[PDB]
């Protein structure tokens, strides 16, 4: 990053033996049937195998195209589902998926609040918004996911859901 | 991994006094009459015969060429007819008897996980996951047995033991 790894993709759970022409063909077959392709041609342009581990990395000869086939994962090829993932190393811009916590009784301290929200995983980010003068909570926070498809759950699991006598809200910033 | 049986053949009532390079030469025949090739070249490696009776084995080059060789059961060779069928090792569903080990202590490293499993009996293969970044393992484990009808002893056995403060998970990864 914070611009790399944009046109590859992590493959998992991928049949025993399986070639690198082989999944190439599969993909691009895919890819076409599926009207995720946005040209003529072939989106995906070489396949790498880890036949030890059983993974393998695809590269893909556009960004938009790469983010596309993400909803490929589960997909099944010859009796396998395969396990579809960004890279290790690619990460989204700052701030892209960073949420509002609203309606939080104000008595409650920053850890106490970081509690509820790490339950569905860790953070990058978190404040917790205080009067600077008395350094008393104003009932409102924002934070950010480190794993970007936490966010979504995050959301599912605490929006209009009662919290004391108050209702949290729960949505991505703006 | 397994695919040492998808290229062999069993062949039996072959006739007395027959030679291995005789029996090769006559299986590449066949198979360039067939047009059964899949490249240029002779797809039979080698051939081991046993005189006392009467059966022989051939090793092929590929995968494929060994099961396109399948449709020779009855031919003639000396005046004989040739009985061809799979081992009785085959595998049609390669990787069903793979198995995952979950659970293992943090600190146990590859010779000590497979002084583990070679109780049971000999691997033909076997990884530790590990962290790329430190080496450090990740705490589960891949392996496949020589024999495969020891994988569900194995599992019995292994499955579900205490190992120090840990407690082990033996299954087939699928």
Redesign the interface.
Same mark, same amino acid.
């Given at each position: 990053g914070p611009l790399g790894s944009a046109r590859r993709l992590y493959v998992g759970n991928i049949?025993? =033996?399986i070639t690198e022409e082989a999944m190439m063909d599969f993909f691009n077959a895919q890819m076409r049937l599926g009207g995720l392709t946005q040209a003529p041609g072939n989106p995906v342009l070489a396949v790498q195998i880890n036949q030890?581990?059983?993974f393998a990395f695809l590269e893909f000869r556009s960004v938009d195209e790469t983010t596309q086939a993400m909803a490929f994962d589960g997909i099944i090829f010859q =009796?396998?589902s395969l396990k579809i993932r960004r890279p290790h190393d690619y990460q989204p811009l700052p701030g892209a998926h960073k949420l509002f916590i609203g309606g939080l009784p104000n008595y409650l301290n920053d850890d106490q609040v970081k509690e509820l929200l790490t339950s569905f995983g860790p953070l990058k980010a978190f404040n917790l918004v205080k009067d600077s003068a008395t350094g008393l909570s104003k009932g409102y926070a924002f934070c950010e996911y480190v794993d970007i498809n936490v966010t979504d759950q995050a959301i599912a699991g605490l929006n209009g859901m009662q919290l004391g006598d108050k209702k949290l809200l729960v949505q991505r910033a703006s």
């Open positions: 049949p025993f =033996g030890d581990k059983n =009796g396998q």
